[PDB]
Structure 1
Amino acid sequence: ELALQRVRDIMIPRSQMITLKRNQTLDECLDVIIESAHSRFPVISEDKDHIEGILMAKDLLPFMRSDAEAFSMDKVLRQAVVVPESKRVDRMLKEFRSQRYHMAIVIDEFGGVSGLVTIEDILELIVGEIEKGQFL
C-alpha cells in the first residue's frame, strides 16, 4: 500500500509550512519555533519558493550556555534535501531510513516548492493503517 501513494498525497502543503526567514532575529525565530512546537524548519530567502536550508531547533541549545559565542543562522543552517512530489512513499521511507534524515522539501513538476514531507508522517500513515484495521 505504501508503494502506491506519492509524497504529494502525504506532504504538508506549501501554504501550511512553518518557515523561518534567513535574516530574522533570534527572538523572531524563537517565537515561531516555540509557538509552532516543531523540531525542524525550512529557512527561506524572500519567499517559500527559495529554500536556503533547514534549521533544527536542537542546534540552538549550545548557544544557551553561559559562555557560548553568539548565535547566527549561518552557524546552524543545514542543507535541505529536495524530492519530487511524484516519489513513491515506500521509496521515500527507504530514503529517510538509509540516508538518516527526517524532512525533505517537495517540489512539483514545474520546480516550485509544493510542500514538505517528513518520516514522521510516513510513520503516522503506517500506524494509522494499524488503527484502521483495529477499527473494522
Structure 2
Amino acid sequence: DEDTRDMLEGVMDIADQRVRDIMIPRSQMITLKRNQTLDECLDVIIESAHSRFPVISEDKDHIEGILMAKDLLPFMRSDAEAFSMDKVLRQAVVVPESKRVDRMLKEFRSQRYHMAIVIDEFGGVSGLVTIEDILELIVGEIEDEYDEEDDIDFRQLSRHTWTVRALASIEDFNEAFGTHFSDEEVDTIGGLVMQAFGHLPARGETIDIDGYQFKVAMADSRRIIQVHVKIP
C-alpha cells in the first residue's frame, strides 16, 4: 500500500535528518517571559493551545526554561496558593542544530520529555524542536480518504502542511493562505499545480511554485484530486 510506503520511507529519513530540518524557527516560536503576569500567560497558552512554552529571560537575553501548561493546574484548587514563575519553571535542554534526528528521538524517549531548544554554533537560539515534529516525519503523508467531496478545501495536517482539495479555486486558496497565485489560464488549485508541472503528475510528485511545496497527495489518470502544500 501507499500510505505504508510513506511511513516506511519516513523512517529512512530519521537517519539522514538533522535537528535543523524539523525545528520551529525562532520567529515561529510561541513563547513567554519570566516577567509576565499569571493572568496574561493564560491568554498566550489558550490562543496557541500548546502544552509547552519556552520562557524568555527578561530582556530577550537568554531563555530560562520551559513551562508546561499542565503545571498550572495545581494553582486552581481551593486551598491553592498564588502562581509564581518558579515552581513550574523546569530548566530546559539545549541541542546543536547539527544533532541527528535519530539521536534526538532516543533521548526524547529515554529521558521522557517532549521539547528541546536548538542553538547554533555561536550560542544563539535557532528555534525549538519536539517529539511530534519527529513522528511527523513518518506519519505526515497520512490522512483519510474523501469521495464526493467536502466543502472543506483546506485542512491543517501538521505544523506547516495543509491538505487541500484540487478543486479548490485559486481564489479561495489565496484568501485562506494569503497567497498571490494567478488565474486566467487556470481556475483551481490542481490546474495551477498541473501547470507548474506541465504534465499530469502522479502521487508523490512535488513542485515548488513560489516557495510553497506542493505534493500530489491523490491523483488518477484524468486529474489531480488532493494536494498537500507546505507553507514556507
> SS at the partner of 1:91?
helix
1:30-69 residue CA offsets vs partner (Å, 9 max, x unmatched): 0100010010000011355511000000000011001101
**Percent identity over paired residues:** 95
Tell me which structure has the larger Cα radius of gyration.
2
- Cα RMSD, aligned residues only: 3.1
Q: Is the 8 A contact 2:35 2:58 kept in 1?
A: no
Contact 1:48 1:113 in 2 (8 A): no
Could you tell me how far apart the structure 2 residues matched to 1:135 and 1:37 are? 20
In 1, the alpha carbon distance for the partners of 2:28 and 2:61 equals 13
Whether contact under 8 Å (1:14, 1:48) holds in the other structure is no
Q: Cα distance, 1:25 vs. partner?
A: 0.1
**SS of residue matched to 1:129:** coil
| 1:64-83 Cα distance to aligned partner (Å, 9 max, x none) | 00110111011210010000
**Does structure 2 retain, via aligned residues, the 8 Å contact 1:106–1:113?**
yes
Q: Could you tell me which of 50, 54, 64 is aligned with 2:66?
A: 54
Q: 1:93 aligns with which of 91, 105, 111?
A: 105
CA distance in 2: counterparts of 1:29 and 1:17, whole angstroms:
15
Paired residues for 1:74-113 under 5 Å: 74-113=86-125
- Residue of 15, 34, 56 corresponding to 1:3: 15
The answer to whether the Cα contact below 8 Å between 1:22 and 1:73 also exists between their aligned partners in 2 is yes
Aligned residues: 133
Q: Provide the secondary structure at the position in 2 that maps to 1:116.
A: strand
Instruction: Work out whether residues 49 and 112 of structure 1, in 8 Å CA contact, stay in contact via their aligned partners in 2.
Output: no
Partners of 2:61 and 2:129 lie apart in 1 by 15
How far the C-alpha of 1:135 sits from its partner, in A, is 20
The change in CA–CA distance for 1:11 and 1:128 in structure 2 (over 3 A counts) is same
User: Shift in Å at residue 125 of structure 1?
Assistant: 1.1
| Secondary structure of 1:59's aligned partner | helix
Task: Detail structure 1 runs of 4+ shifted over 2 Å in the superposition.
Answer: 46-49
2:115–2:130 Cα contact (<8 Å) kept = yes
1:88-114, Cα deviation, whole Å (9 max, x unpaired)? 111111110111110000001111000
SS at match of 1:115: strand
Mapped contact 2:34–2:85 kept (Cα < 8 A):
yes
Displacement of 1:87 after TM fit? 0.4
SS of 1:106's equivalent in the other structure is: strand
Q: Distance in 1 between matches of 2:130 and 2:19?
A: 10
Segment drifting more, 120-129 vs 80-89? 120-129
In the alignment, is the contact (CA less than 8 A) between 2:56 and 2:62 conserved in 1?
yes
Name the CA distance, whole Å, in 2 between partners of 1:64 and 1:135: 38
Cα distance, 1:24–1:106 mapped onto 2, change above 3 Å: same
Asked whether the equivalents of residues 106 and 117 of structure 1 are also in contact (C-alpha less than 8 Å), the reply is: yes
Unaligned runs of 5+ in 2: 1-12, 143-229
The 1:135/1:16 distance shift into structure 2, 3 A limit, reads: closer
What is the TM-score with the length of structure 2 in the denominator?
A: 0.54
Question: Given the superposition, is the C-alpha separation of residues 61 and 82 from structure 1 closer, same or farther in structure 2, using an over 3 Å criterion?
Answer: same
Whether the 8 Å contact between 2:64 and 2:92 is mirrored in structure 1 is yes
